[PDB]
Amino acid sequence: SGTLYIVSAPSGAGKTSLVKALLDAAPEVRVSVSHTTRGMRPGEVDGVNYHFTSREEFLAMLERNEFLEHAEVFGNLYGTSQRWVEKTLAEGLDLILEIDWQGAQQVRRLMPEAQSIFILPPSQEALRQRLTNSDEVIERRMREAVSEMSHYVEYDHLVINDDFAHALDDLKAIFRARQLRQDAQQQRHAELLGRLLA
């Protein structure tokens, strides 16, 4: 079966260009499309950026136990649907959940073999620029981002996004090393290992 990767970053900027770039260079890796109850933004496509749904429909899915994890982020509900994750892993494909620290905690309990990565800004100034890209609102968004970053200690690996080219290669190294671990290689090269041992 495939490997599950959790990738988290401060939520105020949206999903990271780093993960998009990683997926562009490794088309065999899949990414989960989350459900959300927030409204669509210009340039977003239902079924691609998110499965956009209603709060009533989101809660009904929760009652039907369809979410691997869910969380409230800035008052809107987000979640990872479980069936798609199980299907993709069972096909032997690796996949990424780009989710916040709350969802990461839930996933780790259910899947202790999951690799998790937190992507950090190089400075508060750089984080603030990404958020501003109203002043009063900005400081609250910064305080909320700081509270999320405090959870970086819960993650297996950390990437400091100082130089985009360097951070992308750092992500690639984490993913490649994960696939070289004993557990993944034993399954991947099962037939080879049998020939080496017989």
Ligand X SMILES: Nc1nc2c(ncn2[C@@H]2O[C@H](COP(=O)(O)O)[C@@H](O)[C@H]2O)c(=O)[nH]1
Report the binding-site residues for ATP: 9-16
Task: Count residues binding a copy of itself (CB under 8 A).
Answer: 37
Binding site partner of 102, from a copy of itself, ligand X, none, Cβ cut-off 5-8 A by kind: ligand X
3-class SS at 164? helix
Q: Which of 77, 120, 131, 168 binds a copy of itself (CB under 8 A)?
A: 120
Taking the CB of residue 96, how many other CB atoms lie within 10 A of it? 22
Q: Does 38 bind ligand X (CB under 6 A)?
A: yes
- Window contacting ligand X (CB under 6 A); options: 23-31, 72-80, 87-95, 177-185: 72-80
DSSP state of 46: B
Q: Does 149 bind a copy of itself (CB under 8 A)?
A: yes
**In terms of residues, how long is the chain?**
198
Q: Which of 18, 30, 37, 100 binds ligand X (CB under 6 A)?
A: 100
Q: Does 37 bind ligand X (CB under 6 A)?
A: no
Question: Minimum CB separation from a copy of itself for residue 5, in Å?
Answer: 13
Question: What phi, psi does 187 have (nearest 5°)?
Answer: -70, -45
Cα–Cα distance for residue pair 42/49, rounded to 1 Å: 11
Whole-number CA gyration radius for the chain = 18
Q: Does 149 bind ligand X (CB under 6 A)?
A: no
Q: Does 78 bind ligand X (CB under 6 A)?
A: yes
Angle at 44 between CA 37 and CA 82, to 5 degrees: 50
Tell me the two tokens of residue 140: 């609250």
Question: Minimum CB separation from a copy of itself for residue 120, in Å?
Answer: 7
Strand partners, 69: 80
Question: Minimum CB separation from ligand X for residue 71, in Å?
Answer: 4
Question: What phi, psi does 74 have (nearest 5°)?
Answer: 55, 35
Distance from first CA to last CA of the chain, Å, rounded?
25
Positions touching a copy of itself (CB under 8 A) are: 120-124, 127, 143, 146, 149-150, 152-153, 155-160, 169-170, 172-174, 176-178, 180-182, 185-186, 189, 192-193, 195-197
